[PDB]
Amino acid sequence: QDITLYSGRGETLVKPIIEQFEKQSGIKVNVRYGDTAQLAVLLQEEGARSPADVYWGQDAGAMGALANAGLLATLPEAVYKQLPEIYTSKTGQWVAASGRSRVIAYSTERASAEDIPASVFDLTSEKYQGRFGLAPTNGGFQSFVTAMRVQHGDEKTLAWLKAMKANQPKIYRNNTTQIQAIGDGEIDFALVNNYYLPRFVAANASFPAKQTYFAEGDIGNLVNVAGVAVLKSSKKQPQAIQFIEYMLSPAAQQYFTSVVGEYPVTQGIIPNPVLGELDTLLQAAPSIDLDQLADLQGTLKLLRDAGLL
Ligand SMILES: [Fe+3]
């Protein structure tokens, strides 16, 4: 027996997982690598004739479009019902294998946890004037903006974007260069995905930055996910569920958090010290239907209006 996986996750991350899975399970996994968004397009075109059994991506927008297209199988309750709500489809069509949240990174030499405010909306103020990075072409940032739209509407969102632009931010290619820029002294603050600082702290356990959250429920604490789902078209749902349940087993979770630096979705996992406890994230995180992040074109439009793209 074998299954076919379409993976928006990189092979260097995935290969060790699937090989161990094959080893323990007996099931061959035939993987087709690619871009999360691109593989969702392909599935919609392929519709019911797709050979894929499992889809595993690293952005909720692409997954949300599949769910809306009616291409995803409802998972058994045994798979999803025990997971926290920020990590599961409302109606059980996908589950997070790992969490990729938004945080605020900050200089430990020119700032502290004190200077982090209650809301991401508060960063328009003067205290933050010329003290920020932005990476407005980063996927995680764009998905975060989509979420802000969902939560708050476009008007509030665009006022924030422009007010942020008008506060003299520095514009970076990615999160790595934003974190770098903190240690290098160009900026005191950045909004980033959570799994970047853990690499810096590896290479130099005294790197001069930490990352924290805003207040409970703030949209700036959004938890995106690497989501996984079974296709309706599949004729091998048992095997495909076994794969998913493997990915939620403690060994796999521990690997995601320790090797990849992403949050686990289950309890009983030894936390990366840079991230901290899962329980803290659950409190911090906002309640958002992640399937609503399918509207990227809307968000790009606003970014062009704000002049950030
Ligand atoms: Fe990335």
What binds here, in terms of ligands, is: fe (iii) ion
Percent strand? 15-25%
For the terminal residues, how far apart are their CA atoms?
47 Å
- Contiguous helical run count: 12
Question: How many structural domains are formed by the residues?
Answer: 2
Structural class category: alpha/beta
Helix fraction bin: 25-40%
Give the biggest sheet.
7 strands, mixed
Explain this structure:
This protein is an alpha/beta fold and 309 residues long. It folds into 2 domains: 1-97 and 223-276, no CATH class; 98-222 and 277-309, no CATH class. The protein is built from 12 helices and 9 strands. Strands 1, 2, 3, 4, 7, 8 and 9 form a 7-stranded mixed sheet that branches. It has a two-stranded parallel sheet with strand order 5-6. Helix 1 (11-25) links the parallel strand 1 and strand 2. The termini are far apart. Bound molecules: fe (iii) ion. The PDB classes it as metal binding protein. Keywords: Ferric Binding Protein, FbpA, Danshensu, Vibrio metschnikovii, metal binding protein. It forms a monomeric assembly.
